[PDB]
Amino acid sequence: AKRYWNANLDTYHPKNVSQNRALLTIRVFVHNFNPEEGKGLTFVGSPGVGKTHLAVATLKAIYEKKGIRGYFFDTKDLIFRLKHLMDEGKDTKFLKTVLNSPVLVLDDLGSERLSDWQRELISYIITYRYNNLKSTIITTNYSLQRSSVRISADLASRLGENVVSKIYEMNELLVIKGSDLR
Ligand SMILES: Nc1ncnc2c1ncn2[C@@H]1O[C@H](COP(=O)(O)OP(=O)(O)O)[C@@H](O)[C@H]1O
Ligand code: BEF
């Protein structure tokens, strides 16, 4: 939540061409934002590059220029939460607020390997937000370096083809290639 208390599109000073184009693409996005269009952004790249930074920035910028309140979740944290109240039987209120949210950030989306019930929820949340035009921002890890449909096949390996296909329709892809990480 608030290790990025200071993550503004203003505190952001791009450190290369990649980070600069992302910033301009975000500013255009935040400016032209209709929650009824269900368009999001997808941030890909290595660790320390600033993906989560820009995702939190985008979430705030939307809220400070459009007044639309969204949510930031770590994907694993969101999944563990839900799986609990899924098999506790009595909290749907949290699930609806997540699914029906105008803006949702899925941070570190299934970066590693996931169990069947984790793949169940991810596919569920994304298909719902795909069908009901609910704008959703994603940050994800890309392994091998040098290859864009590989950002899709590498993602599809741990999420499935169906999901990555829908992620590609709704979102614009922004690769971030900073070096030296954090
Ligand atoms: N252009 C930038 N300006 C200021 N701080 C940055 C920038 N890029 C990254 N950071 C900081 O570096 C740290 C790691 O970045 P992070 O967003 O977590 O990268 P990733 O999510 O890709 O791992 C964060 O604390 C973030 O605030
Ligand atoms: F350290 Be990461 F790419 F959120």
How was this structure determined? It was done by X-ray
Best CA proximity match to 37, nearest among 136, 177, 174, 167 = 136
Residues at the annotated binding site for ADP? 4, 12-13, 48-53, 182
What resolution in angstroms, rounded to 1 decimal? 2.7
Structural domains in the chain, CATH included, are 15-176 (3.40.50.300)
3-state helix, strand and coil shares in percent for the chain, rounded to the nearest 5: 45, 15, 40
Find out whether the beta carbon of 75 lies less than 6 Å from any atom of ligand 2.
no
Q: How many CA atoms lie within 13 A of 8 on its CB side?
A: 5
Q: Write the single-letter amino acid at 80.
A: F
Ligand 1: distance of its center to the CA of 130 in Å? 28
Beta bridge partner(s), residue 74: 107
| Cβ neighbour number for residue 49 with a 10 Å cutoff | 27
Q: Let me know the angle formed at the C-alpha of 39 by 34 and 40, rounded to the nearest 5 degrees.
A: 115
Find the ligand nearest to 107 CA.
2
CB 134 within 8 A of CB 127: no
Pocket test for ligand 1, best of 15, 21, 52, 53 (most atoms within 8 A of CB): 53
Closest CA to 137 of 72, 69, 47: 72
> Residue 65 corresponds to which amino acid?
K
Give the position, in ligand 1's atom list, of the atom nearest the Cα of 54: 17
